[PDB]
Amino acid sequence: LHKEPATLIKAIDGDTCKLMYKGQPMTFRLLLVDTPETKHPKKGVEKYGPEASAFTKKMVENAKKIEVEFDKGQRTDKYGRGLAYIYADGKMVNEALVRQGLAKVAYVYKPNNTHEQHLRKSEAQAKKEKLNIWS
Ligand SMILES: Cc1cn([C@H]2C[C@H](OP(=O)(O)O)[C@@H](COP(=O)(O)O)O2)c(=O)[nH]c1=O
Ligand SMILES: [Ca+2]
């Protein structure tokens, strides 16, 4: 897995954003996680949705460097969204969300599951600490 530079364009919510990747604006979706909905009517503004968006927005807006890391399988989902592990100043946002109890490990699709165990251990910790989603 290799990390590549990207430029934040706009943070949409806890797990989806728009970035300038390789000179082109694209919307990205975080691999292996699911933060609560704050859009889509068949979900509404779920609990912790606003929280995850806020946590995430601050983290990426104050970053000096953003990097995207694709896994080994497909690089985009059915909606044309890039699928990756995104780091803000070397810190993986995917794991950060899970450790704070603001997202759950979800959508695990082989072979795009390289960091699955790392994220599951962080979620377990969040669970035992009964953090946010886990309270
Ligand atoms: C994270 C991720 C999401 N998805 C799909 C599954 C879900 O499809 P449906 O929209 O058909 O439910 C949707 C979840 O994204 P959101 O959490 O942004 O809604 O995107 C993938 O296809 N691959 C992935 O690795
Ligand atoms: Ca979501």
Side-chain angles (χ1 to χ4, degrees), residues 7 9 18-28:
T7 305
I9 291 181
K18 308 191 85 304
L19 308 177
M20 189 60 70
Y21 174 66
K22 256 70 272 179
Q24 72 200 297
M26 275 191 76
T27 118
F28 271 80

Side-chain angles (χ1 to χ4, degrees), residues 12 17 22 33 46 52 54-55 71 74 84 98 112 116 122 125 133:
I12 298 165
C17 56
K22 256 70 272 179
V33 303
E46 309 186 323
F55 178 76
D71 212 321
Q74 66 194 77
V98 162
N112 277 355
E116 183 189 6
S122 292
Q125 190 60 46
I133 284 179

